[PDB]
């Protein structure tokens, strides 16, 4: 109950809360993100952190009907990964600064953009 409100209200990411169909459709992108790399340690504390939050609320079947967005796709069976827009999405994360999830939030997003350097805001309002 305790790390549960505090990770709920570090991972806002909108302003109606953690149950609306906005933030539910902008935390898909990060759990997809997550899984759809290399198993990092910081990596995975947000995913098994998001997949806590959404068994409490009683959004676990919302959890694993998770996969990537219409809005980074090209084609709907040829899966492509729009990776410009997807940088775009990262770095326009609102991340907040309350302890101790703005630290691993900003790791993860460093190293997230690392990361597919490495292989190499409108999106909440659209999902």
């Known amino acids: 109950e305790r790390e549960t409100k505090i990770f709920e209200e570090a991972f806002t990411f909108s302003e109606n809360g953690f149950i609306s ?5 902008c935390l898909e992108a990060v759990v997809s993100l997550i899984k759809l790399l290399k ?13 806590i939050c959404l068994i409490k609320n009683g959004m676990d079947h919302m959890y694993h009907s998770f996969d990537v967005p219409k809005c980074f796709m090209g084609n709907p069976i040829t899966r492509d990964i729009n990776w410009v ?3 775009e999405f990262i770095n326009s994360l ?3 600064d309350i302890p101790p999830w703005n630290v691993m939030t900003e790791n993860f997003k460093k190293k997230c953009i690392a990361l597919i350097n490495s292989k190499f805001s409108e999106f909440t309002k659209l999902m």
Do not use: A, Q, Y
């Not at 169909?21 to 459709?25: K, R, Y």
């Not at 198993?39 to 997949?51: A, L, M």
């Open 21 to 25: 169909p906005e933030n539910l459709g």
């Open 39 to 51: 198993t990092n340690e910081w990596s995975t504390v947000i995913d098994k952190c998001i997949h």
């Open 85 to 87: 827009m997807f940088r």
């Open 94 to 96: 609102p991340g907040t």
